[PDB]
Design an enzyme around this catalytic site. Sequence first.
Site, short mmCIF file in Angstrom:
data_model
loop_
_atom_site.label_atom_id
_atom_site.label_comp_id
_atom_site.label_asym_id
_atom_site.label_seq_id
_atom_site.Cartn_x
_atom_site.Cartn_y
_atom_site.Cartn_z
N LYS A 106 0.86 -1.18 0.00
CA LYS A 106 0.00 0.00 0.00
C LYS A 106 0.89 1.23 0.00
O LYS A 106 0.60 2.23 -0.65
CB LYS A 106 -0.93 -0.01 1.23
CG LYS A 106 -0.91 1.28 2.06
CD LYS A 106 -1.69 2.43 1.43
CE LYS A 106 -3.17 2.10 1.34
NZ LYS A 106 -3.93 3.20 0.72
N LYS B 97 -9.69 -15.71 -9.19
CA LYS B 97 -10.54 -16.26 -8.13
C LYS B 97 -11.64 -15.28 -7.71
O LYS B 97 -11.52 -14.06 -7.90
CB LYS B 97 -9.67 -16.66 -6.92
CG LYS B 97 -8.91 -15.51 -6.28
CD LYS B 97 -9.47 -15.18 -4.90
CE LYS B 97 -9.07 -16.23 -3.85
NZ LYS B 97 -7.64 -16.12 -3.39
N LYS C 104 -14.59 -10.39 -3.32
CA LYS C 104 -15.65 -9.43 -3.04
C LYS C 104 -15.37 -8.13 -3.79
O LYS C 104 -16.28 -7.44 -4.25
CB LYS C 104 -15.73 -9.14 -1.52
CG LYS C 104 -15.37 -10.34 -0.63
CD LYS C 104 -13.88 -10.69 -0.79
CE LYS C 104 -13.58 -12.14 -0.46
NZ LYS C 104 -12.27 -12.52 -1.04
#
Lengths: 316, 318
Positions: free
Chosen positions: B115, B195, B198
């Site tokens: 990040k 895969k 969400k």
Amino acid sequence: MKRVLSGIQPSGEIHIGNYLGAIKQWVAIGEKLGRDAFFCIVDYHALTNPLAYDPSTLAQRTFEAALVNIAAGLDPEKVTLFVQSHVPEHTELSWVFTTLTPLGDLTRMTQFKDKASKQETVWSGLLMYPVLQAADILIYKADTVPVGEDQVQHIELTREIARRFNHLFGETFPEPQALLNPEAPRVPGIDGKAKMSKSLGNTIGLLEPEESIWQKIQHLPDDTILFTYLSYFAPKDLVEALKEEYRKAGVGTYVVKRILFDHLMEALRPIRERAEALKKDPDYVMDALLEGAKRARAVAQATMEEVREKVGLLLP
Amino acid sequence: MKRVLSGIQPSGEIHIGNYLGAIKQWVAIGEKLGRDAFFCIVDYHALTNPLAYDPSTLAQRTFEAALVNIAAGLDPEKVTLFVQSHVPEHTELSWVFTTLTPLGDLTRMTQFKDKASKQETVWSGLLMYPVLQAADILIYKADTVPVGEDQVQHIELTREIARRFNHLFGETFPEPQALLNPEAPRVPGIDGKAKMSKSLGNTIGLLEPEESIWQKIQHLPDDPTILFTYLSYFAPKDLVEALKEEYRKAGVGTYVVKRILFDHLMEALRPIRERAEALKKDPDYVMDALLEGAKRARAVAQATMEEVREKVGLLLPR
């Protein structure tokens, strides 16, 4: 000022520099504000140096800090004295502020750069302490914090977090202002080399043995320190009349040294006597910290409950 | 394995990817450990992205997280489910831990590092989160923690912290071990690419409207298939094996398979959905399970926190 928060390091070692500078301002704060003069012994600050601090004595050091500052003037029946770790709510508020603090604001702090320079291992407590301090200040909604010339940077951070928080979640916290003590004297150590402070040898402790205070007075250096100390503890009349004579066979050092020792010990006698009274009744001190925690805790919970709601946590 | 701590994200969006993998395992852990199977909805994790998470929306998302996971199978009559912020003691243990953690080990954690490599604000929350997780794990003396393969690092940090603490103040904390889930399927997304996640919006939710799950099956891709992968997840071998042989012979066509998949899929979620509907009508059950899960976890946390305050050498209020 409406509510003031003053931090007290967890130590029993207190010298005339503290007493003459900060302590007298604290007492004055206790006279203006009452129970709203918050004094917090920051025992959790001891842990920032994981290996060097000593778990086996932290308790006595924390207790001693309460006894001595009380003896020095902080009156438990008039102010709010408590131990940092006795009100846990603020570490919870501390996590919330951590999320609102840009890493760069912490790494640039002068105290971090300097300390994480004299260390072979940079412990995170060194970096994050300022956030814990902001939490200590804002959980009590304090608007004024007395600090020294060199500890004003954490108040700036505290202000930034208050603004960022208010902005993201709504007006909640004030922007604390640093309270300085320009009127107080800058006490030089027992050796003109610097200023008085625990870190250096430089001090005269309020509760130091009399022989020790005497030795330090004699071994003082020349130019004049001897007269600086004398001006702190004796009437101006006697002081100017001594310095005029100092240049001649009327008055010679050894004699002004005695006048100093006598005046210094008399100033410290009220303090030393309470110290012994408090040492005879340990329960008085424990009860003051207990009552002080009750009061601060009632305030901290109200604050914490307001914060949980505003940042949106699910309430049970 | 005596006590397990499993972290649940504060969100009501559970997909068949979550279900077929982690949830099925969480359910197994509950059958085995009962009340010592602690399940923690980590609402404090949402605050790590201050300008992005919506505070006016977190309480509801936290409550739905409990509802849906209970609907999916986490049983409050058997386990211990609670919300992280309901047991605040760990934020205190968190400070202690913070002081016992080398900065370098945090700056090098993979999550923080990735990040930090974007022109995004690097909040201290991102850097310090692993320490928060370590206190959550150790405040309850959990010795096992189920995690994905790319989340083992924070369990290693936790053991390092436990060892450091145990050596400096006296044996206090267990060294938690990561519990992986290799037997779980790696469920593919509806676009048939990476895969199911969400975030990629390539999902089939357990509570998603029927008409919506249908359209997604209807559109499952097929080169000249995830279609038979999903089919495998929800229909018996026999039926699946025969349909495949036939799919290869151009006997049975795509449409027929999609309906067999759909019917079998809806039948699998049926019980989850019926539970969700019952909990939705009776939210007191969810809040009470949370309240009770918290009493139970807090009894342990306060004991742990008293042990720590004393060993660290604090002047105790007494």
